[PDB]
Ligand binder design. Structure first.
Ligand SMILES: [Zn+2]
Lengths: 90, 96, 98, 49, 243, 346, 144
DNA sequence: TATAATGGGAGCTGTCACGGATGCA
DNA sequence: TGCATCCGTGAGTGCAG
């Protein structure tokens, strides 16, 4: 949806997710978050010449959900309560 | 709150209660020496550990905040005696 | 010392003690302020042969109506491996009670 | 949803540096400030209702 | 003109036509209150009852000022007051970090604009600019006093929380009246779970003894001397501080 | 109704200049400055003092204030008074009154004529601690700088030179008012230098850097200790009304105890000291518990070493430092029966 | 004497000044290094009060006997820190400004007292229209 | 301190009921 | 003149939080 960015133009190839720098329990202790690093490969292209560069820039950490349905966020388990709302339509 | 080592909130509705009983001195107590009448509060606890009856109270501190907060809105609130001349509830500490 | 008979060299209760309200769980010292001993106080010490001390008891005691049996302790300094805490904090000690 | 709002903020941050600072010596690496994304995610999980 | 060696005159008047609180402090200042009373009643005589109605509403406000001694102009501050620091503090919380009232960030907000206008004056800037500084000046003072009342509300950055303005403090269930004047928190009080005691007489209750101690702690320190489970009251307290 | 769209309208009013009108107005200003010091070496009054008087009449009396830095309080009497010994001049000298007045008026229409530009610069500086408008004024503020320091003779379009002073004053205000605790601009300057170089470190690491990994990429004179204490002042304060919970009937400031004002345990304690110590002065002697009662103070303290102790005690200098010792000495055996002072060391 | 009533009324500009102990000139709080209050800003002690009971700001005078001397070096009274709670400051505005209560509290108290429409008072105040005070004979589209 | 650059940007949504002040056939 | 129509104001207690 957000890509590609427009006038030079910057387009989206693919994302990847890496395994977490610390295992579930290690984050519970060290008041960390149980999250995975988010990389996204991009290609810049020049609106006038034909420029081509392509790095996979690091976007941060996306937190991961454990086996039972919970999350760990600064080392406390949490739940994301589904929300009810009027639905789209006419 | 228990964890702060709280006080019990004695609310509008509790004040009504005491009001309906007519316990003026018990209510006043709640509203000065037991809450924020810094002067008579300190004065009281000294009175208990000294085995004396607690002392009649002065103006709650939170009322002073109510005065100063109405000045900051440019309103001139004024305590007055029966002959209509002001009364300093700040004991001169905010006059020049 | 009775008031410390359960603390290790560093200032931690020993794992397996019994702790009750009032008891120190982790001794700690912070420095006194610009109210460093005022006259009233500089004199009271003048009689007792100890001069004003420069640090303060900020020990973590136990809250009213709490307590039990120290089951674990966690001590995280900085200068130790794997560990780095929010800026300006030397060391953070946690003691789990049961 | 919260992700689609971090992404759109990052896109206010590329085009800003797509039209001020040098329109040819530029990579993806240095046209992307990860922070508008990192923050909307930190938000969703730490202060949502 | 020195090139055409003509002296040009452009058709335009010395009119006095202003904008903002600067204007109104004048119009309010030029109000002979007694006069307007005279006219409003001298018009309270009218029929149709609709003119008679609003010359009452208006007249009420005149006599409000007449009877009290306030000057209408006074509803326009030149000198905005500042509230003592301690009532809007800057404090270091445990982590050596600082917590501060919303008012400072509202004052600062206003002090910048008054300052940057005091400059824009001396550096002689166009109206179109000095105008914008003055406007921005009301909205400053209008948010210090009653943020959000008019226009958008003043939000610190990165949040959508309206700042807490002077009126917001004064008013509401959370305001100064209903939350600190018509009932406070209190010392010498406790809470606990209740439990039926059918052995009590009508006039009695079961107060656990740990609560009892505290709620009477002063009294217990003094008694603790009058018998002597401690020499003086200060040592008396240090006894009961660990169980 | 919306305070931006409004200013955006007042601006859409003064039309954009054209290259001629650029140079015409630019031109008329430079001459009028020259005209002022030429017009001050004829009269010797003062460059600024004069320029303000040229400014007064051109803009109208709508405004006037004693401009700090000029030595007379510029009340419209000294403007008529000085517009007079000015307009008193010979057509070949009072030639330059006409020159200043015309130039001041070009100043105005050149500022007003280039306000749109500031808009489209401060537009890019939002979300930084300063309101759009606030950035605009700061922007315009510089724009004023740009006219008084332009040189049309260099053949530049006015845009090019002003687009420097504009973004010089935005960036200065973005760095001098944004924070509740103001920090020197050069300290701000280097803070962002961490923020930026840490950010690339993270973008190269797949994780946030440590203190150390920062002091390295930060270079020399940078250790792990000094990146730490730099952050701990970067730290913005937090609101006392920061909302607690997800209803809102609690405020993060309420959970904060006031430790300045003395508690009632406390302020009671001080009274049973400062009197149960007066309970050990007049118990063994009250004039040797007065010369030592002025070796300190019952309030204010009285303690230096040897100089007022030698002035008015009754006795000689190193003789009060002896009944100072027998003062204390009497009190250490005094308080071996009334042992009710130990408890005050806690 | 003993309180018996409580009066509320408008504070004149000169009266606001009456209360004040100093123009808060700077938008500064407290020094990012000494964590002490910048002078002439929102927490300055030469305005509001000593921060420590009967202790002057810089060191000058530090106990009860000197009670009320504004030390010369730093300029801070020698009284109880409790006055930081009561001593008003004042900001001294460049161009006068309206108190929004007396504007936007319908029906307006400035807007009825001058037969000024609701929406007129806005325009004239938030700068969307001029308001003629002496037209010096001006005339517009054939009407003085 | 100097190529030139000259009008923004996010709105937010499903309550209610009353009283007062303003607009309009 | 009578009556739409808008704007601003309210919307329970304490405790855990
Ligand atoms: Zn001093």
């Amino acid at each position: 949806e957000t890509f590609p960015i427009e006038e030079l133009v910057l387009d989206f190839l693919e994302y990847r997710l890496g395994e977490p720098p610390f295992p579930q329990d290690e984050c519970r202790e060290k008041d960390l978050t149980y999250q995975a690093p988010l990389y996204a490969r991009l290609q810049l292209i020049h609106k006038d010449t034909g420029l081509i560069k392509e790095d996979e820039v690091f976007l941060g950490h996306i937190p991961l959900m454990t086996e039972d349905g919970s999350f760990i966020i600064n080392g406390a388990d949490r739940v994301i309560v589904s929300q009810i709302h009027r639905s789209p339509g006419v | 709150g228990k964890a702060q080592f709280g006080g019990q909130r004695f609310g509008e509705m509790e004040v009504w209660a005491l009001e309906a009983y007519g316990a003026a001195h018990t209510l006043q107590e709640m509203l000065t020496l037991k809450s924020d009448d810094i002067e008579g509060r300190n004065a009281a606890y000294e009175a208990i550990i000294k085995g004396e009856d607690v002392p009649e109270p002065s103006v709650p501190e939170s009322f002073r905040v109510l005065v100063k907060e109405l000045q900051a809105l440019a309103l001139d609130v004024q305590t007055l005696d029966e002959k209509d001349n002001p009364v300093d509830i700040f004991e001169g500490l905010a006059s020049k | 010392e009775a008031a410390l008979r359960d603390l290790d060299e560093e200032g931690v209760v020993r794992i397996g003690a019994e702790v009750k309200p009032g008891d120190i769980l982790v001794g700690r010292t912070s420095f006194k302020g610009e109210s460093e001993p005022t006259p009233e106080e500089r004199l009271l010490r003048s009689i007792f042969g100890e001069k004003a001390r420069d640090v303060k008891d900020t020990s973590l005691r136990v809250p009213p109506g709490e307590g039990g049996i120290v089951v674990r302790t966690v001590r995280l300094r900085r200068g130790d491996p794997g560990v780095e805490l929010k800026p300006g904090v030397r060391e953070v000690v946690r003691v789990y009670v049961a | 949803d919260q992700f689609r709002v971090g992404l759109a903020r990052l896109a206010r941050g590329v085009r800003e540096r797509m039209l001020m600072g040098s329109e040819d010596s530029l990579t993806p690496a240095k046209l992307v400030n990860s922070r508008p994304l990192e923050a909307a995610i930190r938000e969703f999980f730490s202060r949502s209702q | 003109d020195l090139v055409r060696n003509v002296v040009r005159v452009v058709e335009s008047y010395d009119i006095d036509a202003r904008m903002g609180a600067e204007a109104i402090q004048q119009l309010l200042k030029e109000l002979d209150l007694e006069a307007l009373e005279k006219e409003l009643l001298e018009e309270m005589k009218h029929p149709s009852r609709a003119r008679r109605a609003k010359a009452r509403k208006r007249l009420e406000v005149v006599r409000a000022f007449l009877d009290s001694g306030n000057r209408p102009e006074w509803m326009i501050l030149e000198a905005v007051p500042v509230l003592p620091p301690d009532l809007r503090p800057m404090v270091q919380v445990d982590g050596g970090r600082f917590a501060t009232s919303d008012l400072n960030d509202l004052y600062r907000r206003l002090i910048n604009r008054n300052n940057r206008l005091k400059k824009l004056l001396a550096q002689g800037a166009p109206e179109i600019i000095i105008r914008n500084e003055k406007r921005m000046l009301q909205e400053a003072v209008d948010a210090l006093l009653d943020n959000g009342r008019r226009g958008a509300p003043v939000t610190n950055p990165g949040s959508d929380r309206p700042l807490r303005s002077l009126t917001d403090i004064l008013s509401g269930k959370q305001g100064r009246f209903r939350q600190n004047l018509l009932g406070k928190r209190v010392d010498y009080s406790g809470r606990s779970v209740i439990v039926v005691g059918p052995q009590l007489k009508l006039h009695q209750c079961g107060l656990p003894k740990r609560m009892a101690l505290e709620l009477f702690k002063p009294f217990l320190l003094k008694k603790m001397e009058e018998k002597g489970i401690a020499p003086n009251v200060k040592a008396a307290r240090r006894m009961l501080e660990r169980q | 109704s919306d305070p931006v769209r409004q200013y955006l309208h007042e601006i859409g009013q003064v039309p954009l200049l054209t290259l001629e009108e650029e140079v015409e107005l630019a031109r008329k200003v430079e001459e009028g400055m020259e005209a002022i010091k030429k017009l001050s070496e004829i009269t010797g009054l003062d460059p600024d003092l004069i320029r303000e008087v040229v400014r007064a009449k051109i803009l109208g009396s709508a405004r006037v204030r004693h401009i700090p830095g000029l030595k007379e309080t510029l009340d419209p009497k000294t403007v008529e008074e000085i517009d007079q010994k000015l307009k008193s001049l010979p057509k070949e000298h009072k030639r330059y009154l006409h020159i200043a007045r015309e130039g001041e008026a070009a100043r105005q229409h050149l500022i007003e004529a280039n306000l749109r530009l500031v808009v489209s610069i401060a537009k890019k500086y939002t979300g930084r601690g300063l309101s759009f408008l606030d950035l605009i004024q700061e922007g315009n503020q510089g724009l004023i700088r740009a006219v008084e320091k332009f040189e049309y003779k260099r053949r530049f379009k006015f845009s090019t030179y002003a687009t420097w002073w504009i973004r010089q004053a935005i960036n200065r205000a973005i760095a001098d008012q944004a924070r509740t605790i103001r920090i020197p601009v050069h300290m701000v300057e280097t803070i962002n230098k961490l923020s930026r170089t840490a950010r690339q470190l993270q973008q190269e690491l797949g994780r946030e850097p440590t203190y150390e990994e920062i002091a390295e990429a930060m270079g020399p004179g940078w250790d792990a200790k000094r990146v730490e204490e730099t952050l701990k002042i970067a730290q913005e304060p937090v609101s006392l009304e920061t909302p607690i919970g997800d209803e809102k009937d609690s405020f993060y400031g309420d959970f904060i105890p006031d430790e300045h004002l003395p508690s009632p345990v406390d302020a009671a304690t001080q009274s049973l000291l400062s009197e149960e110590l007066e309970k050990a002065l007049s118990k063994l002697s009250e004039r040797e518990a007065m010369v030592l009662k002025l070796r300190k103070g019952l309030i204010d303290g009285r303690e230096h070493t040897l100089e007022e102790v030698g002035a008015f005690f009754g006795v000689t200098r190193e003789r009060i430092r002896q009944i100072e010792n027998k003062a204390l000495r009497k009190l250490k055996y005094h308080e071996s029966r009334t042992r009710k002072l130990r408890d005050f060391l806690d | 004497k003993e309180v018996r009533k409580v009066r509320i009324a408008l504070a004149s500009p000169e009266k606001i000044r009456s209360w004040s102990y100093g123009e808060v000139e700077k938008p500064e709080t407290i020094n990012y290094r000494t964590l002490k209050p910048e002078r002439d800003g929102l927490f300055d002690e030469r305005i509001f009060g000593p921060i420590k009971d009967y202790e002057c700001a810089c060191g000058k005078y530090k106990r009860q006997r000197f009670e009320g001397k504004v030390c010369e070096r730093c300029g801070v009274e020698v009284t109880k820190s409790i006055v930081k709670r009561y001593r008003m400051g004042h900001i001294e505005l460049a161009t006068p400004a309206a108190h929004i209560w007396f504007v936007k509290d319908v029906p307006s108290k400035i807007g009825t007292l001058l037969d000024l429409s609701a929406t007129e008072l806005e325009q004239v105040l938030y700068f969307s229209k001029y308001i003629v005070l002496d037209p010096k004979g001006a005339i517009l589209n054939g009407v003085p």
